[PDB]
Amino acid sequence: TTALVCDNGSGLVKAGFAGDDAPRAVFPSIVGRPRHQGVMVGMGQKDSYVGDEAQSKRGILTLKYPIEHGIITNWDDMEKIWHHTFYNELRVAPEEHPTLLTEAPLNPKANREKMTQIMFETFNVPAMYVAIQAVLSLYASGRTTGIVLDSGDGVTHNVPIYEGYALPHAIMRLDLAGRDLTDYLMKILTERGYSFVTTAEREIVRDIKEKLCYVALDFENEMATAASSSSLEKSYELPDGQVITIGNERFRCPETLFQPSFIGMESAGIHETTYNSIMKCDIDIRKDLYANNVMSGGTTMYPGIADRMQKEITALAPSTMKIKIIAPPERKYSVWIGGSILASLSTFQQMWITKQEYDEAGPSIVHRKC
Amino acid sequence: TTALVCDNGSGLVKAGFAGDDAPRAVFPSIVGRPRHQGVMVGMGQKDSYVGDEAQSKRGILTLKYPIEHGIITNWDDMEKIWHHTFYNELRVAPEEHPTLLTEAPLNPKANREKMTQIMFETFNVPAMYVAIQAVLSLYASGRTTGIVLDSGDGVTHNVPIYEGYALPHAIMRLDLAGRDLTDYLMKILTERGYSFVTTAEREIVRDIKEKLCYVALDFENEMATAASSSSLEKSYELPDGQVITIGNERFRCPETLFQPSFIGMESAGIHETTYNSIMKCDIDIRKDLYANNVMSGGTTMYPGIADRMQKEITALAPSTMKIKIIAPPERKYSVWIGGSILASLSTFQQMWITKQEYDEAGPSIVHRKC
């Protein structure tokens, strides 16, 4: 009876049963294949590896992400992620109970339809349902009104909601995300003499980005501080020894959000898109959105990002408007907890996309119901 | 008043006065030291030899390149190359007039700064200026728009430019270069029974690579042709007699560019990096870059490389886009002629890094001005 959930993130897969506070299994969204010949006999060494198994053997594997900017490029590869998600990671049959999926807004219709075409034919779930990755965050926060900021590894949206009413006119999409931070972080390290120029070497640079980078509340003041003081310099032990030390690169890449002029994207910035999206709404709605600015998903773990975003929107926003940015510790999963909650609703049982309705209407049934 | 130029290539030094069509002196970027004891008395036989003098005595000298992948390893050695460049090769004082230098993009900041620290203290030029090796090629070609491919002995970059505006987001760097071709050429000859396993023996294999190798427009078709027909087999007279004959090895190594799977580098290839770099740019810019694909620097002398690259990008690129790859005969020096031109500009007189400004700001003055 319980329906499982699969986030299908643009950089990380997060799946678990509904009504559960923590997910059962999480693994990176990667598929690798050998770039070297197999000398051994009776070694196994098959073609495809996914999840944390790929990181174990990444040295001799070239990693390609099947999901990119919330858009699926390799469909045969993404099919392997789901087979590994259910059978290998969770060890649960999909045919017994339905599944809940998530996807970023304004994606192409083919991704939204083809996603459904694979489930019922390959795995044959009893039913299915897709949901915008943003809306689930409210369920986790337990508030009807607010503006959500996903910041996943592929895309960020900045959609406002007012008492549960989504406004498609105010919704936004910006492709800047963690892979751009990693690709930019791989670039600026060239300055310090460290070179990471492969798929396997990318993952270490991503690992450096997680535990060591901060948002730099005051960029211009901190850059002058970095050159004068070496206190910010810290080291990370990449494999193969070769300790390293990053200084102003520690906080150069996360600034790409607030100003993407470094990477070259013609975008206003994360702070101004939330300012733009709120101004697209009616005048009466703006008060509650400033008071309820939900922060969710990955890329929001940089310490002080709530302080930078509160300091920044406050300058653009008018006085007398109280700005409170909700950055709970449980983010990086809040989209998932919304799925456990959204599947738990008894009302939600009507909204599933059953097998019998698919054969009648075809894969175009998603748009009218979802 | 005239300012000299020094390319400081990763495998070849090319220096001459500005406003000159041909360079005054060219010599390999090598420093050698004896690996045998000196039996003679009053023989000279000092420690260091550089340039073509080293090739003369290479039999009893172990050659180490001071510049490697556009990165300087032995600083005391590279100082000797410049002393030989000005005093011995050109016979010109550096203190009288300033000097123009070149360096590959995305190099570490230490190489970019330490390069400056040596000039003003050791040689004491009146001023200096550094420039990315790619931009100079446009000056030689006399066109504002285009995408450049240096292919020097150390590194290749593939940077696009649009009306003189460099885009750092689209720039690329790949360490595959001629030394990898030579090291790979030294490997595959083992197959034919020829063994070159020393620094001195490396130079003959490099000499074989220059005058005898071609790009093989159709690799798979030509390999089957090589086994069936012996017409492609030619001979080279290495010293010590011992004539040799290479067949499919004649064109096996330059294919490492288009597919580095042979040497094992996890890279897309030279054809696809130019395809990747152009796609990173805006949509309107792509038309002119396809029409203006400049080919410069060493490693581009393989006959038909313009045909292979035009044939290859045409398959990846969409129809209706005219692809014209500019491979002038004067390449292998086009970076230098840009230096003679770039120094000749009257506007350029403001952009020098003078001695008086160095003492005020220190060696960190390079980044803001250059």
Partner: peptide, 7 residues
């Protein structure tokens, strides 16, 4: 890139 056309 990863779109049916621009990007």
């Amino acid at each position: 890139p990863a779109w049916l056309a621009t990007c």
